[PDB]
């Protein structure tokens, strides 16, 4: 039944999935709403599914690397069920993108450029980097997946491309990196004994701690700047600083929850912003 | 199983007659040029720089054989020559500055797959054996490299229809670089390898190769399927955007 394959479907997710895939889309649509004043639900759902599907396909590209050793769901898995699901997810993504073209007023070339350059660019280098350096390749993915999802959603919504969504989507990329780094630090010794290398293993424990703290606290500086210099109504994400201090004092579920709340308040900040008070908006 | 036979045929037929294929292809290139001296300067500069970064980033003489570096150099010369001649002679001379980061990086990248075939070839002992090894190396490395080149050419290709001029030019150079690399790797790289190994038998890399080549060289099965779907999608984008638009 469906519940017996929900375990198969949870294989393509990670603790940083909701944030990295679904927060950008909401931000992008909020920016599109602020810029133009008309939002479309159909395109919003389409962008959400397309970005989530592509991210899932990439997670399965990584999941397949856990068959080298018995790292491994309440069933027997083997390397056909992963391949089939990867193909199905990516095909779903492409069908969604085709639907978005048909519904939206964006040019096919720009849509293809974003969707096959940015979102699906991970597949071009990942695969044949080995099983050891799968975690190191993830940083570059999560740096270049956060902003591109925002802009993809924004462009599809409005009908023309723009540069500023990449600038507005820095905090989300940083907080997502903090989640990934935190989860890497959590599995330091296991990865060390297994032969896997991550950033936390390479830089050491104290540098991983300072890097964690940097990646956690940069968003709040960016929100304070963007508050005091552009629009005061954007200052909501500073309200969750007690949680950030609690996280810093207790050093990934709580980090993931923090990111979720940061993202929510950042979207509520963007929506409530006055008309004309935001750069290029 | 179907494609491997065809690539094995190609590898064998190229490696069997090295000199005739290499002179024929060089003739074809200079014919394409002449029918329609800065080429040498750009070839040399580009070659030295690319070969030097590869020479550095890869650990010098880690295996204990310089033939790999010689073969890599002879690959780089031809790749850079074939790229440079088109850039200088045909496209635009004045527009070749500061956006040669992508072609510069793609060759660094494509050198590994050229070195692989050299490692496949060097483990031989006899002349018929080295020809057979080149054939098997080609049969293994051909399909994957073809797919990689195709998808890269189509992605960077769709980059050339954006509207932003700088992106159009950079992407155009990217596509030319990929096609030059693939053309050189297929046509007259194995001829060069075969000829170098024929005209010169202290090549001892048998056991490591014959245990790890058919295991360590294997890509990720998910990536390959996604690349095939990307390829198909981009072919539809290109067909529509160029003919129906």
């Amino acid at each position, epitope marked *: 039944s469906w519940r017996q394959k929900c375990a198969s479907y949870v294989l393509a997710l990670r603790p940083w999935s909701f944030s990295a895939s679904l927060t950008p889309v909401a931000l992008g649509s909020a920016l599109a709403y602020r810029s133009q004043g008309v939002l479309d639900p159909r395109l919003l759902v389409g962008c959400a599914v397309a970005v989530l599907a592509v991210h899932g396909a990439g997670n399965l590209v990584s999941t397949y690397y856990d068959f080298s050793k018995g790292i491994d769901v309440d069933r027997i898995l*083997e390397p056909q069920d992963v391949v089939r699901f990867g193909v199905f997810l990516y095909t779903l993504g492409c069908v969604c993108a085709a639907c978005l073209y048909y519904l939206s007023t964006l040019k096919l070339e720009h849509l293809a450029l974003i969707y096959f350059g940015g979102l699906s660019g991970s597949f071009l280098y990942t695969g044949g980097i080995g099983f050891k350096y799968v975690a190191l390749g993830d940083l570059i993915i999560l740096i270049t997946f956060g902003p591109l999802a925002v802009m993809f959603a924004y462009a599809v919504q409005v009908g023309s491309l723009a540069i500023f969504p990449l600038v507005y989507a820095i905090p989300l990329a940083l907080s997502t990196e903090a989640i990934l780094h935190s989860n890497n630090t959590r599995d330091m010794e296991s990865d060390q004994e297994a032969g896997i290398v991550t950033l936390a293993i390479l830089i050491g424990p104290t540098f991983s701690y300072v890097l964690y703290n940097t990646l956690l606290f940069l968003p709040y500086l960016i929100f304070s700047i963007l508050a005091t210099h552009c629009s005061i109504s954007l200052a909501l994400p500073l309200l969750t600083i007690p949680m950030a201090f609690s996280l810093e004092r207790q050093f990934p579920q709580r980090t993931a929850k923090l990111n979720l709340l940061l993202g929510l308040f950042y979207v509520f900040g963007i929506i409530l912003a006055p008309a004309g008070s935001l750069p290029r908006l | 199983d179907k494609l491997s036979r065809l690539f094995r045929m190609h590898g064998l037929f190229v490696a069997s007659h090295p000199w005739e294929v290499i002179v024929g292809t060089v003739t074809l290139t200079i014919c394409m040029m002449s029918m329609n001296s800065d080429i040498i300067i750009l070839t040399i500069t580009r070659c030295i720089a690319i070969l030097y970064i590869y020479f550095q980033f890869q650990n010098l003489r880690q295996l204990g054989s310089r033939y790999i570096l010689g073969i890599a150099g002879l690959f780089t010369i031809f790749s850079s020559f074939v790229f440079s001649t088109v850039v200088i002679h045909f496209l635009d001379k004045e527009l070749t500055g500061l956006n040669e980061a992508l072609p510069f990086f793609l060759l660094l990248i494509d050198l590994s797959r050229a070195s692989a075939l050299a490692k496949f070839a060097l483990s031989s002992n006899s002349q018929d054996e080295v020809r057979e090894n080149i054939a098997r190396g080609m049969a293994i490395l051909g399909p994957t490299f073809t797919l990689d080149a195709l998808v890269e050419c189509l992605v960077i290709g769709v980059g050339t229809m954006s509207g932003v001029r700088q992106l159009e030019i950079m992407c155009c150079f990217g596509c030319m670089s990929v096609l030059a690399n693939y053309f050189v790797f297929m046509t007259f790289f194995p001829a060069c390898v075969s000829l170098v190994l024929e005209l010169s038998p202290i090549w001892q890399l048998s056991h490591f190769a014959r245990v790890l080549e058919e295991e360590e060289n294997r890509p990720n099965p998910v990536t390959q399927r996604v690349k095939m779907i990307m390829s198909l999608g981009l072919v539809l984008v290109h067909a529509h955007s160029r003919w129906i638009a």
Partner: antibody
Amino acid sequence: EVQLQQSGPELVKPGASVKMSCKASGYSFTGYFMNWVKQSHGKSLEWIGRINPYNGDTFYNQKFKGKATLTVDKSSRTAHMELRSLTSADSALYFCVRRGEDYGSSYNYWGQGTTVTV
Amino acid sequence: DILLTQSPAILSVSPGERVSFSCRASQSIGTSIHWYQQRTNGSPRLVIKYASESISGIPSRFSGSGSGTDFTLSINSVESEDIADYYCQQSNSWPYTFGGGTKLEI
């Protein structure tokens, strides 16, 4: 229709090494694992290990880590097992077993046994 | 190495009568059990996957039950084609471990 055709009996001497073949046929050989099972005299089954046919990344049971080495031949659709340093307690059947087609199946397709005799 | 145990070693029955085996694990293994049937001079064949779910090509008289640690297989009415050894396998944690095996008798 999947069928796993396995090699015939093997009468051998002590201290030697022995190679077994299980020619897989009727499906995409490179998709599923190729497990191995030992049935001793007394009829008590034991799990040896597996091998991913695409890469070749094996994964053994700890007991059989030293004296069982699984190899694969992608060209001819054949999975191999090499037993080394045989003793009196290796006279046993060896099955090559594989999981079902759909997700969530257990080990349907077994071989037929290679009656090794030390 | 989860130790699986089984409780008649040899089990005598009469044609028509209901039979019941038991595969008592050494750990909470969920619904991860598989009951194989091995006749004289053959390979084991699957009967009940995951302690409950039936198999296509098996007669309907074979049914399983139980969860957690203690499992059970049952045959409604035995015939001359149900005289074999039955092994329970767990697929929860590597390495997989078969049971001792229960033989039947008329």
